[PDB]
User: Fold this.
Amino acid sequence: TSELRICRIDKESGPCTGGEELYLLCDKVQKEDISVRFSTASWEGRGDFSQADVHRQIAIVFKTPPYEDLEISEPVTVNVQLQRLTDGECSEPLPFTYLPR
Amino acid sequence: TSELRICRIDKESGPCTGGEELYLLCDKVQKEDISVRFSTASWEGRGDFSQADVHRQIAIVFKTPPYEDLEISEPVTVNVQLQRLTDGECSEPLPFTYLPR
Assistant:
């Protein structure tokens, strides 16, 4: 109830040794009343995190624009950033590399 | 200013043909005054999304627990879910598969 829902987990696999840092996207939860449970029909395990590790974020779903040159033979890593429409203010850039066909 | 900051992009690469659905995590933005800019020193492109595509989410950073059997020779995909400490209520499960050493 209260709708505990996980939207996704950045990684779908990892070493059985554990201790691997991951992150999951979910709907509203109470950081003082939430935990992560890994399990099978006969085993149970918990993710290691604190309240400081529960971040309120915004997620934007979008389709990439086609690159200027659809005939590139070599990868081309461009910049990706947030930009405000009103003032045209940008955020720092993050890389994204386009791959040839 | 107002601190436009991107935390990450699920994919770091993709076809130069574009039209690839992605998502990025960032800090507070105004969905009616925000856009995504792809660019080089001489080229500019925009991500395709609407206001409906800007979601307020929670992200939890955590380390995975080690699996019960560290000697598995075959992958073992267990369940991962949110669980409330107070009532022990769980969310639907998402799969995560442990890999042998």
Summary: The first strand of chain A starts at residue 6 and ends at 9. The beta strands of chain A are 6-9, 13-15, 21-26, 35-40, 43-46, 54-63, 76-83, 94-99.
